[PDB]
Every structure is written in structure tokens, then in C-alpha cells.
Design a protein around this nucleic acid. Structure first.
Lengths: 70, 117, 151
RNA sequence: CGCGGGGUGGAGCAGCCGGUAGCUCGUCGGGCUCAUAACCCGAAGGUCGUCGGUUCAAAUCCGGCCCCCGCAACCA
RNA sequence: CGCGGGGUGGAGCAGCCGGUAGCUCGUCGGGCUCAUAACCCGAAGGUCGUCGGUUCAAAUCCGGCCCCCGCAACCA
RNA sequence: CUUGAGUCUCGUAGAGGGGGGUAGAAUUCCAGGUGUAGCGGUGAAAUGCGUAGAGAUCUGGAGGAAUACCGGUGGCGAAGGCGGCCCCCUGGACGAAGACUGACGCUCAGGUGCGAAAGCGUGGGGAGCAAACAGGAUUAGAUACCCUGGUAGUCCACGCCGUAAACGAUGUCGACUUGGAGGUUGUGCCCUUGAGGCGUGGCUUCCGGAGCUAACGCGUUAAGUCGACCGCCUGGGGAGUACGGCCGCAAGGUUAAAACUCAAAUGAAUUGACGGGGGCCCGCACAAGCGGUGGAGCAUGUGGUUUAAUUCGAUAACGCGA
RNA sequence: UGAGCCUUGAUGUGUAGGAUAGGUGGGAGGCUUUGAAGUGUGGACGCCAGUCUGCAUGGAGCCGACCUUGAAAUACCACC
């Protein structure tokens, strides 16, 4: 996330840009992930579980949507 | 002491404590300050405010060097990350570059075990 | 409460000076619903204070109050294992009240003989920026300052 | 006996020119705290071992004495 | 017999100068606690084995005795 | 004889296996520079490391281990498992057409092999992580959880071990039975007029029909409808234990009882209740305030004790029946 | 990089105060064309009031007992 302040650019704006860049990188997230050792099994489980959740969100909810709430 | 116009601010931002170190562009440290040093302990020094004040202190310390331009290198995850740089800006250096320098391995060493809480 | 915020009840201004704040102060002072005695005491305090500092009765009182009003107070969140006192900006209605209460407390404490006299003394102290109420205010501020990291 | 350190607030470590008279833990009050400690604020405790003098500044520089240290030498 | 440790609050471990006379669990007291083993506050329990003396400080240093230890040596 | 089974031709995708190289990031240590009082850690602390100059920061070096992003309910493998890049050796799968062989097939007790992690042996290696161990906390205690360190081990070579919730808790092979939405990898045609259009094969994720099922659910990848072969079960405990055998350096594995004992034990779903599960909401529940009780004296009721008797009851009881 | 020394320079806030008074003795005017007061500032110290001093400019005056004070002028001076 290397950044250079442009000529006649505000500080705040620059900071914001930097933040955005960082977010894009996913650096903080990566750091968080590597704080502690995740057993392979655990890693697998999370990934599959997450996937399942995503699938549920996509399809079941869509089905629900077809019918009106009131 | 020899005055220097341009330098780097290294911001080591941990979860527990922020450390700000102003150095010349070559690597040689001019001054440093910490949230733990600024009169904050435990709960207090792991905060953005603490980090900011550390930064301020650091800035104050490198007054005699007469530093105008400054590039910032931000390391680690923490509260003292955005706040610290803001503080630095306030203190009145022309911030030139804002770099992230967190050490991310490309899967290298095994981290320590996960805490059971 | 949980359900509904309610509008603060109507307060009549005192007969002598025609002030809401004064009335409030008198009420605060009062004990056992003996309002009249309390108001008399307040009046006495004012008069003596006026004599001492010059100015007016009301103006002097206001000035005194001003030196004991807190910009910031603290409250206990305690989200962690140990308790964290957090500062909070204390609102116009509340700040005025707090100062008055503190003053009253100081008066109660004080070693002088008559209540009114004590009150007057307290007021004077406040005006000058020494005494008990002022000290309390300082302490309150100090605590906030200490815990400024939390926001 | 001779010679190098110096002698303090309940103990301890106090900024070459004599005008600064402390900091830690401690005890009490309060603030916050579930607690306790940590944390914040403030408060009582001196002689500067002593006797004197150079000088308005003196414990703060010197003359002697009492001790604590350290010295290294001695002993029919 | 001789020689090294010393002899206490219901048991135990108590700060080289004799002026400090305890801490743990225990019993009572009261609210915490959905319940206590609670956290926290306070309260009754001595002789310092004993007989004496150096001294205003003594159990606290010494002379003897009774025991608990430990000693290592002995035994026709 | 050619429909099953196999062989040949050309391609295809792949973390399939074995061997040997190499790359970059990051951690650790070493040497040196800059620099100055903290660092570290937690819920909060402390142990620990620091003025003998740590932490931070820059330069150079060493060494080990693992491969960010790509990366996907993606791929490959009989299962175990397999993930940077390159080369060498090497196994399987699938498709396209043809050509050939001509039932050569399926299953398999014994038998043989492969078989995560930990563990064992001998020899290397050792950065990080970390059983054991030590200290610091926490606690009534804390031989734990948390913190600071930390050795076997993890890594490599060659042997052994032979087990795991080794799971899809679902043996293998073949045939047949409505559909939809994808993913991946081929391939035929079509103006690819464009990322497309219409098919046809392989593997694969989810939903769901008939049917099946104790229900939950399964549902063309069956737990449906059938056939072939094998493995295995016969109430719970005792027990996957003892004895004996076989195997193993050992740890142990494997095979596998009985007495005695209970009238249950179990599975799925149901209604509640509960949760230091989750969401939404309320109440002087807290918060914000004011005044009390707990200390005092007395009144009064109760417990207790006392008494010849201190009447009996209440114990959301205790100025209560009274 | 430490550290002496012949020497010639600087250095010194009790409050009274012209304000950054170390002390003794000889003393009432020392310096000024081998260039005096005012101005520009380069480097030092610092109790932020100022003090010493380099080079430039300027060319005919600044500082004395003073009023105070336990002690009087860095008016010249030697001793340290």
C-alpha cells in the first residue's frame, strides 16, 4: 500500500486514500488470520461452513422473497 | 546536532502498545516515543488517543533536528495507526508518503497456538 | 426509563427576583417540603453575598455558579473485566443542576453556624475560586482528563 | 592512632559556582472500583550528627569532636 | 549419663542489638451466594515448660531441673 | 458373435507419485550502526527482557521450516492423502473417431500390499511451534484454562508401528426408474455475424418428485426398483477386557470369552422447562436522584433460652391470625 | 581522544538596586588617530533579563562617588 501525496492534495484526503488502499490489500485481515495457528481441519470447516451459509443466503432467501410479507 | 530537512516516521502499531520512531532517510533514528512512555498503562496505552500523544511526544523530541518533510511507514495492526499519523500531521510536518509495512509472511513460520478463552 | 421520554415539569420563578434558576436552587436546598424556610435562607445568603461582592444579588450568584459548573463528567461502562470510567459531555440542563447540588452539599458540610451564612460563604468561595464545590468540580474534571483515552 | 567516601524527613539515592530545601514504598482523606492492586488528587512527618567561623544566601566552603564506610600498613 | 536444635495462644512457622507481644485453617457474629469451600469486616482463646538471676524493657542474655529432637559413640 | 472386459491412434486437464534443483516473503540468532528508557504481556497483573543500551530503527551474514496472493462446497488420487517455481523418472483418468481381441468378466474367506497423527529404532538436522518441565497469575484449591520461558517431537534419510469420528458413521460390480439450478473438464455441429446458439460424453455441489424410511431424511452420485459376491450384527453393562495364540524393539495391535449383574439400554421426533445460546420487548430492574434500614434508646413481632405455664397457629412468616 | 602548565582573555542575579555586586590593598579621572558613542549581525553562554566578542559601518565621546547598600564600581590596578 505505497502512496505518495499529490501536489496541492489535502492531508485528510490522502489519509482516506491510504485507508482505502489498505482495505483493498486486506492487510489487517491477513494479520488477524496469522495471529494464531488454525488447524487444517478448522480452516477446512470454516471454509465449507461459510460456503454453506452463502448458499443458504442466496437460494432459500430468494425463495422466501417470491412471497409477500404482508 | 546536525539539522535534517527530510526523514521517516516509523509507526510500530501493536495491539498492546504503539511506538513512534522518527529517523533520517538513511535509517539512523533521531528520536522515539511510546504510548507506554506517555503515561498510559494497560487498558489506556492500547488506544488511539494514547498513540496520538506518543506521536506528538516524538514530534516534540525531534524539534531540534528541524524536520519539515516526513514520510510515514505504518507497521502492524492496532488503534495507533490512523490516529498517530493524524497527530503527526497536526504537529506540522509535510507528510510526503504514507506506506504500509506490515510483515506478511508468504506462509513461513507456524504461529503460536490459539487461545482458549 | 425504557418506554417513553417525558417533558420536564413546569417550575415557577421565585417572587423576589423572578428567576427560574434561583427557584430551582431553593428547591434543591429545601428539606422535608419546607420550601419557605429554605427560600428565606437562600435570600439571606444572596443578600450577604451581594453586600460582600457588590454587583447584584442574582448576578453574583450566577458568577459563583459559573466557577463550579462541570464541562465534563464521567460514567461507568465496565464492558471489560475491570471497570472503565468514561468521560461524557454533560448537557446544559444537567450541568447547572450539578453545580447547585455541589454548592448545597458544601454548605451542609461547612463549620459555620447559620445555614444561610454558610451558603453565602460557599458562594463567595466559588466566586473567588477556592472552597469545597470548586474542589469537587476540579476532581470531576481531573478524573475525566485521566480517562480521556476512552471516548 | 595516620589516609581516601559522609553523615538527614519511617529506610534508603538527592543537579561542578554557598540563594533550588525531593523521589519511591509508607499512614490518612477523597475519586473511580464488584474486588484488590494498579491508577488520579491532596495531606502529617528535619536535624541536615555536632560544636563553631568565611558570608545577607549555608546542611551546602572550611578548624576541631561522635559515629558509619572503606583503606591498606602493624602487633613485643 | 556427655554434645549440637528449643521448648507457646485448638496444631503448627514467628524479623543478628532484651522495649515489636503474629499468621494459616478453626468457632461465633451478618449479609452477599439460586447453594456453599467463599471473597471481604470484627470478635473469645498465653504459659512463652520450669525454677531463678544480669537489667525499667525479658519469653527474648545467662545457672540448674522436665520433656521433645537430633548426635554420634558404647554394652560385661 | 460383439453389446461386457481389454489393446492400439491422437489429444486433454490435473496439489497424482518418486528424485533433484531453485525463488521470494516472514520469524529467529549473530556482527555492526543510529538511538534512549522502557519493552513485553493480560480481563487486570506479574514472572520475563532492558541504561552491562533492550524495545524501535537501518546494514550485512547464518540457518531451518513452510509456501501469502492465485484458491474455488476447484482439481487429482484406491484410501491414507497431495498446494511456490523449474527439470528428470513415473502411475492413473477422460474425450475423439476408427481398427483389433472375442466373455478374456464380477466378487473374494485365507494371503499380499498401501495405510493420518502420535509413537519406536539408528544416523542427521533444529528457525518457528511445543507434550513434559519451570516460574508468574487466576482460584477455596488450579498438578488446568491465561502469561513468560521451554525439552522430546514436529523436519530429512532408512527401518518398524498398523491404528483414528481412517466418516458419506452408507462394501464392491452391473442394470433400470420423473425434474431443476450450478461447478469443472473434454468434444461434434452452427453465420463464433459477440462474451454466444443447439447438442453429446466424464467427474462433481445443492434442491426436490415417485418410491423408500422409526422418523430425521435419501432421492439417477438412492437410503428407490432388482441381481452377483463378500464383510458384519443378535439386549445393556462386565468388555473390545481377561486367558491363550499370532505379530511388535517397545508402546501395544490383532483374534476374543466367562462368571456376575440390571430390566432396561438405545434411536428419531414431540410438548415443556432450562442455557454463563440468539433476537425483540417490558417493570423504581438498573442508571439518574431524594429519603431511609443496618449503629443508639424505646415500641413491637419472631427465633432461641428459661419457666409450673411461658396457648396454639404463621416461619409469598416475623406491628402476621390478634 | 584523555589531561596538566608558563601565559593572556572570559566567568561570577540573597533583597535594598542604573542591573547577571567573588574578596584585599594602591586610588579620583583610564581609553580614543598602532582609531570613541550609535547601527548591521557571524558564533557562544543563559536564572530570557541580558553578557562577552568577531567582522562591517561610523567618525568625535561613552563610562565615577552617584539615589540606594552588611560590601562600590569592569574610572586604570596587581594578588589570586
Amino acid at each position: 500500500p505505497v502512496i505518495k501525496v499529490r501536489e496541492n492534495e489535502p492531508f485528510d484526503v490522502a489519509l482516506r486514500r491510504f485507508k482505502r488502499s489498505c482495505e483493498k490489500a486486506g492487510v489487517l485481515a491477513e494479520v488477524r488470520r496469522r495471529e494464531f495457528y488454525e488447524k487444517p481441519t478448522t480452516e477446512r470447516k470454516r471454509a465449507k461452513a461459510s460456503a454453506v451459509k452463502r448458499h443458504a443466503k442466496k437460494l432459500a432467501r430468494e425463495n422466501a422473497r417470491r412471497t409477500r410479507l404482508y | 546536532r546536525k539539522q535534517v530537512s527530510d526523514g521517516v516516521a516509523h509507526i510500530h502499531a501493536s495491539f498492546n502498545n504503539t511506538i513512534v520512531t522518527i529517523t533520517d532517510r538513511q535509517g539512523n533514528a533521531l528520536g522515539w516515543a511510546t504510548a507506554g512512555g506517555s503515561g498510559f498503562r494497560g487498558s489506556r496505552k492500547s488506544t488511539p488517543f494514547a498513540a496520538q500523544v506518543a506521536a506528538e511526544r516524538c514530534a516534540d523530541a525531534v524539534k531540534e533536528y528541524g524536520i519539515k518533510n516526513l514520510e510515514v511507514m505504518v507497521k502492524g495492526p492496532g488503534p495507533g495507526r490512523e490516529s498517530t499519523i493524524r497527530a503527526l500531521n497536526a504537529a506540522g510536518f509535510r507528510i510526503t508518503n504514507i506506506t504500509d509495512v506490515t510483515p506478511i509472511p508468504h506462509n513461513g513460520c507456524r504461529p503460536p497456538k490459539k487461545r482458549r478463552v | 426509563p425504557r418506554r417513553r421520554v417525558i417533558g420536564q415539569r413546569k417550575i415557577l420563578p421565585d417572587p423576589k427576583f423572578g428567576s427560574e434558576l434561583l427557584a430551582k436552587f431553593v428547591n434543591i436546598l429545601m428539606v422535608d417540603g419546607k420550601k419557605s424556610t429554605a427560600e428565606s435562607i437562600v435570600y439571606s445568603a444572596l443578600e450577604t453575598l451581594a453586600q460582600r461582592s457588590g454587583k447584584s444579588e442574582l448576578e453574583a450568584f450566577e458568577v459563583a455558579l459559573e466557577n463550579v459548573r462541570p464541562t465534563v463528567e464521567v460514567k461507568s461502562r465496565r464492558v471489560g473485566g475491570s471497570t472503565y470510567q468514561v468521560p461524557v459531555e454533560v448537557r446544559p440542563v444537567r450541568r447547572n443542576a450539578l453545580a447547585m447540588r455541589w454548592i448545597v452539599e458544601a454548605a451542609r458540610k461547612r463549620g459555620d453556624k447559620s445555614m444561610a451564612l454558610r451558603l453565602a460563604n460557599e458562594l463567595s468561595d466559588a466566586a473567588e475560586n477556592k472552597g469545597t464545590a470548586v474542589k469537587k468540580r476540579e476532581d470531576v474534571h481531573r478524573m475525566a482528563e485521566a480517562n480521556k483515552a476512552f471516548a
